[PDB]
Design a protein around this ligand. Structure first.
Ligand SMILES: [Zn+2]
Ligand SMILES: [Zn+2]
Ligand SMILES: [Zn+2]
Lengths: 279, 98, 53, 49, 45, 56, 74, 147, 92, 53, 65
């Protein structure tokens, strides 16, 4: 069949066409020979203005509801009838899960972007004997982690682990294979301003902190083994710099780090703070 | 109209309470034959009893509203011919100054 | 640039140009609308004196 | 030449309204058509008919 | 990197991508366009 | 009229499918592809056709 | 009082002029104290759009000069 | 002037009488779908991008915006917006040479003209970089206007 | 007595933004509680953890009213309550 | 331009500014010159620098 | 919005007349009709212009640049 149409000026035919499209006159014209190739060009503008296609695809279902010309016996008749055919698809989990993440990201005020970004993660895998279930929650929240990270932001695991408790062991373990599945199907830098956000300080702290954060890892000090701990250590030796009292008492209740990590990380970074005088 | 304003509504409790203390004979004990010339009292279109000397009652009320004792947005009407006295404190009435 | 008012009003060498003839309406070029008498109502022009009554 | 009749004259407040001509005049000679019916589209902004 | 203007600061910003969308010396959050250096031409006719 | 109107035909047995022009695909930006209600309804009926097929 | 939770998650006071430009919604949050009981502190519940010049708006009683500072016509 | 028509002194028009300004605000935004397709604000070029509007583009800066204070005519690309697409997706004609993205710009109304007053860039609630554009134009009183 | 004229203005009331938000907010708050009951039921049902963040849906209210003001919808049942401000002229 | 006034607005007002023009005949009509958009015998070039201090 | 150039009907350059006019009231406390007599717009195609102009540009400058 080959089912293809490609415009070609019969008088010239010099190449794959070098032509133009006079949208206002609704035609297409040979830019050299001037012959009108095809006319009655059709608008496609006003069609979509009146108007999930990303994830489910051609699996179709139409949201419905009662009518005005309808009795109460017609109202709850439809509400009972609208659920008797939900068996035909196994997107019911998805239609609850996509609802659930929609409840999830929005409730903790995630940007609407993460809503689809997390949706992208779940629909990506949705089935693997490596998952074979897997508590049904990592596929939600680790998808958000996959979503939010893909949404170019990130939150600490506790902010999500306490948000969704999956014992954190199989949660992360099944989380990792999602990246492998991501690679098979194919980062503290954003944690900076959010941390100072809840404490309400001016804007110049972060870059000053970011300069300090950059220096620690490059020379030495893998610093954490799960180095999420030293994300705060980047910050605290900056709040130790300035005179606003936010001592580890307030950070420990806000950022939730044990002073065993805070004091140890602070002092070992007091050794190398000599090379850390920017201004 | 340029002078118009809309009533925001208040709590009617003071008036009704105040009404009882000024001779509003409670409706539960009302005996129409025994007081044929009573003046029915309404508050936001809710009958709350009857009275017997409305003229004493009426100008007493307005004075309170003018004293600021009753919030000025509260509208009250004495309808002589109907033996009916009405009071409104509803939210959304249309009123103008005069 | 050297322009002429007929194009645009910016090149206007002149302002309001007063202009009048026949101050007394003796040429009958105009009929004076009036309620009781034109003379009592229509004021005389500033130049009416400059010509004979 | 003097006007035979007099004129009522004097200032008066005047206001300008939205309906400028340039936002009301249009023409069409074989422009685009709709997709459903292939009759010409409506709306001067979208080059209506 | 093209010139922008802070929303109140009226500060030269001359920035590119991967820059903190913000004004130097003041954390302002909106950027103007810092009009072109090629001249305009008019007719008051 | 036994040549054009047999009351037996008054009861639908095989419903026809209108070609795309009757129910054009609202294709916007190659991804925001809207479809007319009839497109969905034909799919929607087809599902209600699908279930009753196998369910019995 | 009105404020906005931005993309990162930071929440800062929102001014009406900014709202119009950045397509924001001049709202403020709601917070309710909840008492929970088991028988034999403050909880956020949502936002609320605020009428401009209302008692709670930042423009409630600002100075004329201050209004010019906030770029809002008196 | 019959039938509610008028007769307006030409010179008074020439002296600014009933002259007035006009300000149109064009705003556009890039929307990513699943953080896979990335709508982009940049100056498109008639060579490396496909299916582009036949208006001129040079009034754009590098980032796809028109510098303010620049006179513009109708059918001129105010905002340079592009959308990546899969090279082997539809094969809508010439896609086998570009492979990059297609034009999705927002030109000026063909019937409008004037000077771009100011252009601002900012983000929505969700950090999406977008831009509003304001166009200034003087509307001289003319024959058809309604008073 | 005459037939009661129902076009009399005294029999009319005007519902401004205050009451209009109230009744619209009244329902929105109601739906919030019912949902909070659902989460409260399941945790008692299944001895699960009880998280207020999980219990309370933030975007019920906010995304409720925002849409409720974006379009004149007050639910059908009402139209044209909200109009974009007409800034043609200061008088307008 | 950083005024609170539109460009053409200011430009239009600049047009309505009268200039001494006694020897206007000593200039050449703008279209008559073969000049490149102007010339010393065809036009007068005026500049203005104003700065709020 | 700011002292229009010459009156539309007549054309007497009227831009310079503004501040002098303003100088009159705040200093000599004249009546406007008497003021213009001192000012010198004896016709009334201009006598309108200064009388009914609005100085909006003053309120404009209240916005810090
Ligand atoms: Zn050809
Ligand atoms: Zn010359
Ligand atoms: Zn004059």
């Amino acid at each position: 069949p080959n089912l293809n149409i490609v415009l070609t000026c019969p008088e010239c035919k010099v190449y794959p066409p070098k032509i133009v499209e006079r949208f206002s006159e609704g035609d297409v014209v040979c830019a050299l020979c001037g012959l009108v190739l095809s006319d009655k060009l059709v608008d496609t503008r006003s069609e979509w203005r009146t108007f999930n296609p990303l994830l489910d695809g051609n699996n179709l279902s139409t949201r419905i509801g009662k009518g005005e010309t309808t009795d109460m016996r017609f109202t709850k008749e439809l509400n009972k009838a609208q659920g008797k055919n939900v068996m035909d698809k196994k997107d019911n989990e998805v239609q609850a899960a996509f609802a659930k993440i929609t409840m999830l990201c929005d409730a903790a005020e995630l940007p609407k972007i993460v809503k689809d970004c997390a949706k992208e993660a779940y629909k990506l895998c949705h089935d693997e004997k490596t998952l074979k279930g897997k508590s049904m929650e990592s596929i939600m929240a680790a998808s958000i982690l996959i979503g939010c990270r893909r949404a170019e932001v990130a939150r600490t695991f506790k902010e999500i682990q306490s948000l969704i408790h999956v014992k954190t062991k199989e949660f992360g373990k099944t989380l990792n294979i999602m990246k492998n599945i991501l690679r098979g199907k194919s980062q503290n830098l954003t944690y900076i301003p959010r941390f100072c956000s809840h404490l309400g300080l001016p804007m110049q702290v972060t870059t000053s902190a970011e300069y300090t954060a950059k220096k620690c890892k490059e020379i030495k000090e893998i610093a954490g083994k799960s180095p999420i701990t030293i994300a705060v250590v980047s910050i605290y030796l900056n709040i130790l710099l300035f005179q606003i009292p936010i001592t580890a008492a307030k950070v420990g209740q806000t950022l939730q780090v044990t002073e065993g990590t805070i004091k140890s990380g602070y002092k070992i970074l007091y050794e190398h703070r000599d090379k850390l005088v920017d201004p | 109209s340029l002078m118009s304003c809309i009533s925001v509504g208040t709590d009617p409790m003071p008036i009704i309470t105040f009404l009882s203390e000024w001779g509003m004979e409670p409706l539960e004990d009302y005996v129409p034959h025994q007081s044929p010339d009573a003046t029915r009292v309404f508050v936001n279109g809710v009958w709350h009893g009857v009275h017997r000397n409305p003229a004493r009652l009426m100008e007493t009320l307005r004075t309170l509203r003018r004293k600021g004792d009753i919030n000025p947005e509260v509208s009250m009407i004495r309808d002589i011919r109907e033996k009916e006295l009405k009071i409104f404190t509803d939210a959304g009435r249309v009123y103008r100054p005069l | 640039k050297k322009g002429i008012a007929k194009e645009h009003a910016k090149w206007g060498p002149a302002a309001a140009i007063e202009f009048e003839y026949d101050p007394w309406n003796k040429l009958k070029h105009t009929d004076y609308w009036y309620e009781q008498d034109s003379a009592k109502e229509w004021p005389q022009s500033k130049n009416c004196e400059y010509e004979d009554p | 030449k003097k006007l035979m009749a007099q004129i009522f004259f004097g200032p008066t407040y005047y206001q300008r309204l939205r309906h400028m001509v340039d936002d009301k005049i249009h023409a069409r000679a074989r422009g685009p058509m709709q997709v459903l019916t292939r009759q010409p589209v409506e709306g001067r902004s979208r080059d209506g008919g | 990197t093209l010139k922008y203007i802070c929303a109140e600061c009226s500060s030269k910003l001359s920035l590119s991508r991967t820059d903190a969308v913000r004004c130097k010396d003041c954390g302002h959050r909106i950027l103007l366009k810092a009009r072109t250096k090629r001249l305009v031409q008019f007719e008051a006719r | 009229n036994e040549v054009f109107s047999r009351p037996e035909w008054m009861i639908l047995t095989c419903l026809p499918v209108p070609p795309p022009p009757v129910r054009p695909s609202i294709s916007f930006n190659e991804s925001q592809r809207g479809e007319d209600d009839l497109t969905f309804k034909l799919a929607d009926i087809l599902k209600a056709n699908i279930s009753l097929e196998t369910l019995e | 009082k009105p404020m906005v939770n931005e993309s990162d998650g930071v929440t800062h006071a929102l001014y009406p002029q900014e709202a119009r430009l950045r397509n924001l919604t001049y709202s403020s949050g709601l917070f309710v104290d909840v008492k929970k009981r088991t028988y034999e502190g403050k909880v956020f519940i949502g936002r609320l759009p605020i009428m401009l010049r209302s008692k709670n708006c930042y423009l409630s009683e600002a100075t004329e000069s201050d209004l010019y500072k906030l770029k809002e016509c008196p | 002037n019959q039938e509610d028509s008028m007769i307006m002194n030409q010179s008074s028009i020439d002296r600014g009488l009933f002259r007035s300004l006009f300000f149109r605000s064009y705003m556009d935004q890039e929307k990513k779908y699943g953080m896979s397709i990335t709508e982009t604000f940049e100056k498109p070029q008639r060579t490396n991008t496909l299916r582009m509007k036949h208006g001129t583009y040079d009034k754009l800066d590098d980032d796809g915006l028109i510098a303010p204070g620049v006179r513009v005519s109708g059918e001129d690309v105010i905002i340079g917006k592009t959308t990546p697409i899969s090279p082997d997706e539809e094969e809508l004609g010439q896609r086998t040479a570009y492979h990059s993205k297609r034009d999705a710009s927002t030109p000026l109304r063909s019937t409008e003209n004037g000077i771009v007053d100011q252009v601002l860039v900012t983000t929505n609630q969700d950090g999406l970089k977008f831009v509003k554009v304001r166009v200034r134009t003087t509307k001289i009183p003319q024959i058809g206007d309604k008073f | 007595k005459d037939q009661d004229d129902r076009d009399h203005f005294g029999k009319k009331r005007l519902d401004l933004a205050g009451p209009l938000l109230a009744q619209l907010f009244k329902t929105l708050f109601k739906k919030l509680t019912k949902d909070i009951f659902r989460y409260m039921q399941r945790t008692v049902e299944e001895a699960h953890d009880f998280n207020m963040k999980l219990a309370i849906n933030a975007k019920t209210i906010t995304s409720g009213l925002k849409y409720a003001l974006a379009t004149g919808n007050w639910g059908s049942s009402r139209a044209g309550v909200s109009q974009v401000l007409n800034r043609y002229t200061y008088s307008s | 331009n950083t005024t609170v006034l539109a460009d053409e607005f200011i430009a239009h007002r600049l047009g309505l500014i009268p200039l001494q023009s006694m020897d206007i005949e000593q200039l050449e009509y703008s279209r008559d010159c073969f000049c490149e958009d102007h010339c010393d015998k065809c036009s007068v070039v005026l500049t203005l620098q104003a700065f709020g201090e | 919005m700011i002292v229009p150039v010459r009156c539309f009907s007549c054309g007497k350059v009227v831009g310079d007349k503004w501040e002098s006019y303003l100088n009159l009231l705040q200093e000599d406390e004249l009546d406007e009709g008497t003021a213009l007599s001192r000012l010198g717009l004896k016709r009334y195609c201009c006598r309108r212009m200064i009388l009914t102009h609005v100085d909006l540009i003053e309120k404009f400058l209240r916005y810090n640049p």
